[PDB]
Amino acid sequence: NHNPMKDIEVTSSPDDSIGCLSFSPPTLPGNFLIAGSWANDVRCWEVQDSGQTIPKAQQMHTGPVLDVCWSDDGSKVFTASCDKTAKMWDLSSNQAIQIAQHDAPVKTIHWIKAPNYSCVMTGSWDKTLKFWDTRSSNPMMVLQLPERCYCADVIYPMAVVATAERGLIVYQLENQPSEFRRIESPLKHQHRCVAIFKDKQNKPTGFALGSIEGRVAIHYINPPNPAKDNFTFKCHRSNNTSAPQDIYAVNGIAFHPVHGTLATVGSDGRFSFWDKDARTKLKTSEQLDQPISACCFNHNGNIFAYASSYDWSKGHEFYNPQKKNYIFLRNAAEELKPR
């Protein structure tokens, strides 16, 4: 009932609801998974090819951890928190230092490796997008956002930020980060998740964007017929019945690194696999007894990780501290292969 897909559970899962997941880069041998929770921690497990999980290390923020990411060499883990700061976490030494500070919670964190520079990008509810070299206390660059940062993604040379009030901005990253285009958002309700997808030549070419109204947008940066090539589709809904349709929130979107297909996880407690080129739904899971709060893939796309956690979609009265959170692992390479 808690694990209807009969998937593998990560042992020693977080004490509070899970906010973010992140797998190690391919520059690291094997697979390492990072999760931040609302109990203010950041944890790291080693996933093993047999499927067994081994807890490896844990760090601490003074407020809930909203985002995490890795550095290209897999030596450092970056954490972003509601205590208005972000930390650099050296796994081998198991020490973590502050590298960023904002005036509001820090919602998003990403690592930019460009041929000529490297930095950490932070997007925050203080309406700023800041970049840090991890040595100086002064940010290398500071850009203003149109409203509070709600989600973001980076695949050099491109970045996407989504904010409150349908704010949507693409960034070009070659040499120095700069604003590329402010998009009139294809979605009409709260932005919640964004993930960038690449073309047939591994070139970042567009993004997928999830709202709270059971909808995801497919947006190409520069297609030949944008009226037909860009589209939205409905997901994470109920239903043969005339009862009203129940519309849940899209909580996470991740693209499978080799197949180019995508996964979405939702407040309805399900995950769905999609082919955005064929425009088809490949799979939908069974329902879990609580929302799925986050998801992500490993580097080669052979582990699909999703987190069973309350997401406050119904407010404080539906939170049960009594009820346990899980991270589940699924091999869905074959499930996400097109056709």
Partner: peptide
């Protein structure tokens, strides 16, 4: 599972 068409707006 069962591949199905998307519900495109």
């Amino acid at each position: 599972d069962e591949e199905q068409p998307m519900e495109i707006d």
